[PDB]
């Protein structure tokens, strides 16, 4: 592959719930095409499951920790964390991870894994159920600069990690 | 269809993560257990199964789940409910966290089950379409006594109704 091709938004939509904090929000639908057309530097990273336990690997906390560097120093407009979980759960997870502001980091639901499947970064979990795998993607000016998924999302944080991504920023 | 028929377990399985007293307010590192519904029913005379559309549905929105949790002691202690199974299509970790966020400190008698891809819930027609072939569970309750569905009811607008899915409506059938 996707690298150096236009970001394949198609008609795919994600939902997320803002966090202001800065003090019952509800899911906003956002078109990938709009998000990508409206934002020059977008990091998108898939996670298999909201509330995956801390005792297992996760790349997401890296993204949260480096959020400030990404946004201030590396001019990242939007970090979209993508799961197939419902948007409330993804919101709750985001807060659980210390997201206090979704200006630049949104925990997107990709309902039915459809966007994630469409780029082949899905994770079959049985019976035609798809979670997202673990992957990261950099889109720059509508172009996929970087797209990689873990071969084993359950143990691997390599190509999806913020460090790897940061290397492509 | 369902009332007064054997619980239609089929091959449907759910997943849940246990919450014991060793981890009720701590972050858990438990693998989801997969449990076939036939196994649940087989081992528990008296089971309440109730679907919800979304783990972590906002606390400002109407939900039947808190009632199940508040009535849980009564259900177990006075109504001999063996299990309350709260079903969503959300991942078992989300569900377990949700359970914790609702005060569940013990899954002995209540479990927040994942019904992946809404397959079981669809199978009983109690789902909630939410766009593009995506199904959440509707809001519904069901009582299974000795393998037999004694009560099954889905809200018409799960968004807004907590009537037949409510623990009170259920209580009034136990």
Closest-CA residue of B relative to A109 is: B90
Element (H, E) at A89: helix A87-97
CB atoms within 10 A of CB B72: 19
Fold classification of A1-169 (topology level) = Glutaredoxin (3.40.30)
- Residue A56 touches chain B, beta carbons under 8 Å: yes
SS3 label, residue A129:
strand
- The experimental technique behind this entry is X-ray
DSSP string, chain B: --TTSB---TT-EEEE----TTSSSS----PPEEEEHHHHHHH-SEEEEEE-S-TT--TTS--SHHHHHHTHHHHHHTT---EEEEEESS-HHHHHHHHHHTT----SSEEEEE-GGGHHHHHTT-EEEEETTEEEE-SEEEEEETTEEEEEEE-S-TTT--STTSHHHHHTT-
SS3 label, residue A88:
helix
Contact status, residue A19 vs residue A93, Cβ threshold 8 Å = no
Pick the CATH number of B1-174 from 3.40.50.620, 3.20.20.70, 3.40.30.10, 3.40.50.300: 3.40.30.10
- Residue B55 touches chain A, beta carbons under 8 Å: yes
Query: What does the domain layout of chain B look like in residue ranges?
Result: 1-174
B56/A129 touch (CB, cutoff 8 Å), yes or no? no
Sort out which chain A residues have CB atoms less than 8 A from B132's CB and list them: 111-112, 114
**What is the rounded distance in angstroms from the CA atom of residue B161 to the CA atom of residue B106?**
28
Structure tokens belonging to residue B1? 């269809």
CB atoms within 10 A of CB B125: 12
Given resolution (angstroms): 2.2
Sort out which chain B residues have CB atoms less than 8 A from A129's CB and list them: 116-117, 119
**What is the rounded distance in angstroms from the CA atom of residue B119 to the CA atom of residue A144?**
35
Structure tokens belonging to residue B32? 């989801």
């Amino acid at each position: 592959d996707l690298v150096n091709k236009k970001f394949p938004a198609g008609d795919y939509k994600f939902q997320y719930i803002a966090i202001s904090q800065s003090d019952c929000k509800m899911p906003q639908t956002v078109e990938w095409s709009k998000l990508i057309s409206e934002n020059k530097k977008v990091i998108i990273t898939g996670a298999p499951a909201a509330f995956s336990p801390t005792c297992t690997v996760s790349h997401i906390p890296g993204y949260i920790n480096y959020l400030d560097e990404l946004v201030k120093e590396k001019e990242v407009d939007q970090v979209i964390v993508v799961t197939v979980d419902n948007p409330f759960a993804n919101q709750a997870w985001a807060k659980s991870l210390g997201v206090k502001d979704t200006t630049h980091i949104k925990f997107a639901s990709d309902p039915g894994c459809a966007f994630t499947k469409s780029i082949g970064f899905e994770l079959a979990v049985g019976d035609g159920v798809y979670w997202s795998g673990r992957w990261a993607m950099v889109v720059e000016n509508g172009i996929v600069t970087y797209a990689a998924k873990e071969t084993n999302p359950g143990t691997d944080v390599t190509v999806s990690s913020v460090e790897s991504v940061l290397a492509h920023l």
